[PDB]
Amino acid sequence: FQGMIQEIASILVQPGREADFEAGVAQARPLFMRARGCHGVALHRSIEAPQRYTLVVDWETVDNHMVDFRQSADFQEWRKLVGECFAEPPQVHHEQKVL
Amino acid sequence: QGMIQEIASILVQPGREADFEAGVAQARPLFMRARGCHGVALHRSIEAPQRYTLVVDWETVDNHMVDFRQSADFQEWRKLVGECFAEPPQVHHEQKVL
């Protein structure tokens, strides 16, 4: 359907880097808000696996994320802010709300 | 201490997607009446159209994993959507940080 999509990024943080990561996302959040077609950024943490987090980003289109955001210098700044926290590259997919 | 989300990753069998979506809409009362439950949303993957994420809001994890799981309505839920599944759903719980 025609409307918003959500990028879902499943992140695994290196043991002990969780506070650093949260701090980094908090600081990096404005990079996303000012990205073309971005209407929101939220960070969730797993209860069962506390090193695992989910970034949920609201995009108008998937290309606003995968083309526009990914080719911008703000992506390079996001990776400078939180990249060292990652245990491996996040698993990223996109969703649409059905109900 | 506050609201938690159940996150259920579901893989639907080929062609059963509209049936599953139907059964989720039909199951909305079962959730609404479950103890500690404050909402249900359904998301579908763009890359993998047989994959859905069910996001359910609970006061506590036990509301879901003890109270809801051990109730007749869990069984009613499974009767409504269970034959659409390709394998057993992967379930975890999250809390909002930012």
Coordinates of C-alpha atoms in Angstrom, one line a residue:
Chain A
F1 CA 0.0 0.0 0.0
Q2 CA 0.9 3.7 -0.4
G3 CA 2.4 5.2 2.8
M4 CA 5.2 4.9 5.4
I5 CA 7.6 2.0 5.6
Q6 CA 9.8 1.0 8.6
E7 CA 13.5 -0.1 8.3
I8 CA 14.1 -2.8 11.0
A9 CA 17.8 -3.1 11.9
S10 CA 18.6 -6.0 14.3
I11 CA 21.8 -5.1 16.0
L12 CA 24.1 -7.2 18.1
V13 CA 26.3 -5.1 20.4
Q14 CA 29.8 -6.3 21.6
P15 CA 29.7 -7.5 25.3
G16 CA 30.0 -4.5 27.6
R17 CA 29.4 -1.8 24.8
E18 CA 25.7 -1.3 25.5
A19 CA 25.8 2.0 27.3
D20 CA 28.3 3.3 24.7
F21 CA 25.9 2.2 22.0
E22 CA 22.8 3.8 23.5
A23 CA 24.8 7.0 24.0
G24 CA 25.9 6.8 20.4
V25 CA 22.4 6.2 19.0
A26 CA 21.1 9.1 21.2
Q27 CA 23.6 11.5 19.7
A28 CA 23.2 10.2 16.2
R29 CA 19.4 10.4 16.2
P30 CA 19.3 13.9 14.5
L31 CA 21.4 12.5 11.6
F32 CA 18.4 10.3 10.8
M33 CA 15.6 12.9 11.6
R34 CA 17.2 15.3 9.1
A35 CA 17.6 12.5 6.4
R36 CA 15.4 12.8 3.3
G37 CA 12.0 11.3 4.0
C38 CA 12.7 10.2 7.6
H39 CA 9.8 10.7 10.0
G40 CA 11.2 8.9 13.2
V41 CA 13.9 6.8 14.9
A42 CA 13.3 4.5 17.9
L43 CA 15.8 2.1 19.7
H44 CA 14.5 -1.0 21.4
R45 CA 16.4 -3.5 23.5
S46 CA 15.8 -7.3 23.8
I47 CA 14.8 -8.6 27.3
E48 CA 16.0 -12.2 26.6
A49 CA 19.3 -11.1 24.8
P50 CA 20.3 -7.8 26.4
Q51 CA 23.2 -7.3 23.9
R52 CA 20.6 -7.2 21.1
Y53 CA 18.7 -4.1 20.0
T54 CA 16.3 -3.2 17.2
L55 CA 16.5 0.2 15.5
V56 CA 13.1 1.1 13.9
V57 CA 13.3 4.0 11.4
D58 CA 10.3 5.5 9.6
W59 CA 10.9 6.2 5.9
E60 CA 8.5 7.4 3.2
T61 CA 10.0 5.0 0.8
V62 CA 12.7 2.1 1.0
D63 CA 14.8 4.2 -1.5
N64 CA 14.9 7.1 1.0
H65 CA 16.8 4.7 3.1
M66 CA 18.7 2.4 0.8
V67 CA 19.7 4.9 -1.8
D68 CA 19.4 8.4 -0.2
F69 CA 20.5 7.8 3.4
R70 CA 23.1 5.2 2.4
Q71 CA 24.8 7.5 -0.1
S72 CA 24.9 10.5 2.3
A73 CA 27.8 11.7 4.5
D74 CA 25.4 11.3 7.5
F75 CA 25.6 7.5 7.0
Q76 CA 29.4 7.8 7.3
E77 CA 28.9 9.8 10.5
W78 CA 26.4 7.3 11.9
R79 CA 29.1 4.6 11.4
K80 CA 31.8 6.7 13.0
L81 CA 29.5 7.2 16.0
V82 CA 28.3 3.6 16.6
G83 CA 30.1 1.2 14.2
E84 CA 32.8 0.2 16.8
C85 CA 30.0 -1.0 19.1
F86 CA 28.7 -3.7 16.6
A87 CA 29.7 -7.4 17.1
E88 CA 28.8 -7.9 13.4
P89 CA 26.8 -5.9 10.6
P90 CA 23.2 -5.5 11.6
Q91 CA 20.6 -7.5 9.8
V92 CA 18.3 -4.9 8.1
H93 CA 14.9 -5.4 6.4
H94 CA 11.9 -3.2 5.7
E95 CA 8.3 -3.6 6.7
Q96 CA 4.8 -2.1 6.1
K97 CA 2.0 -2.0 8.7
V98 CA -0.9 -4.3 7.7
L99 CA -3.1 -3.9 10.8
Chain B
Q1 CA 9.3 -0.6 34.9
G2 CA 6.8 0.0 32.1
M3 CA 5.3 -1.3 28.8
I4 CA 7.0 -4.3 27.0
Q5 CA 6.5 -5.5 23.4
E6 CA 6.2 -9.1 22.3
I7 CA 7.8 -9.4 18.9
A8 CA 6.7 -12.6 17.1
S9 CA 8.5 -13.3 13.7
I10 CA 6.1 -15.5 11.6
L11 CA 6.7 -17.3 8.3
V12 CA 3.5 -18.0 6.5
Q13 CA 3.2 -20.8 3.9
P14 CA 3.1 -19.9 0.3
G15 CA -0.2 -18.4 -0.7
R16 CA -1.7 -18.4 2.9
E17 CA -0.8 -14.7 3.5
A18 CA -4.4 -13.2 3.0
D19 CA -5.8 -16.0 5.2
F20 CA -3.3 -15.3 8.0
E21 CA -3.9 -11.5 7.8
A22 CA -7.7 -12.4 8.0
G23 CA -7.2 -14.5 11.1
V24 CA -5.1 -11.9 12.8
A25 CA -8.0 -9.3 12.3
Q26 CA -10.4 -12.0 13.5
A27 CA -8.2 -12.6 16.6
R28 CA -8.1 -9.0 17.7
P29 CA -10.6 -9.5 20.5
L30 CA -8.6 -12.5 21.9
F31 CA -5.7 -10.1 22.5
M32 CA -7.7 -7.1 23.7
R33 CA -9.3 -9.3 26.4
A34 CA -6.0 -10.9 27.5
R35 CA -4.7 -9.7 30.9
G36 CA -2.2 -6.8 30.6
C37 CA -2.6 -6.4 26.8
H38 CA -2.7 -2.9 25.4
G39 CA -2.3 -3.4 21.6
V40 CA -1.6 -5.6 18.6
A41 CA -0.1 -4.5 15.3
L42 CA 0.9 -6.6 12.2
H43 CA 3.8 -5.8 9.9
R44 CA 4.7 -7.5 6.7
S45 CA 8.2 -7.8 5.2
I46 CA 9.0 -6.1 1.9
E47 CA 12.0 -8.2 1.1
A48 CA 10.3 -11.5 2.2
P49 CA 6.5 -11.2 1.7
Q50 CA 5.8 -14.5 3.5
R51 CA 7.4 -13.0 6.7
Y52 CA 5.3 -11.0 9.2
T53 CA 6.1 -9.4 12.5
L54 CA 3.3 -9.4 15.2
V55 CA 3.9 -6.6 17.8
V56 CA 1.9 -7.0 20.9
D57 CA 2.0 -4.5 23.9
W58 CA 2.0 -6.1 27.4
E59 CA 2.4 -4.7 30.9
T60 CA 4.8 -7.6 31.7
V61 CA 6.4 -10.5 30.0
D62 CA 4.5 -12.9 32.3
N63 CA 1.2 -11.5 31.0
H64 CA 2.2 -12.9 27.7
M65 CA 4.3 -16.0 28.5
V66 CA 2.3 -17.2 31.6
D67 CA -1.1 -15.7 31.6
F68 CA -1.9 -15.6 27.9
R69 CA 0.0 -18.8 26.9
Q70 CA -1.8 -20.9 29.6
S71 CA -5.3 -19.6 28.6
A72 CA -8.0 -21.1 26.4
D73 CA -7.6 -18.1 24.1
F74 CA -4.0 -19.0 23.2
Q75 CA -5.6 -22.2 21.8
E76 CA -8.3 -20.2 20.0
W77 CA -5.5 -18.0 18.5
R78 CA -3.7 -21.2 17.2
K79 CA -6.9 -22.6 15.7
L80 CA -7.4 -19.2 13.8
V81 CA -3.8 -18.8 12.4
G82 CA -1.7 -21.9 13.2
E83 CA -2.3 -23.8 9.9
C84 CA -0.9 -20.8 8.0
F85 CA 2.5 -21.1 9.7
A86 CA 5.4 -22.6 7.7
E87 CA 7.3 -23.2 11.0
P88 CA 7.0 -22.2 14.6
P89 CA 7.1 -18.4 15.2
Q90 CA 10.3 -16.9 16.8
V91 CA 9.2 -14.8 19.8
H92 CA 11.2 -12.4 22.0
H93 CA 10.3 -9.3 24.0
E94 CA 11.7 -5.8 23.8
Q95 CA 11.6 -2.5 25.7
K96 CA 11.8 1.0 24.2
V97 CA 15.1 2.7 25.0
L98 CA 14.9 5.9 22.8

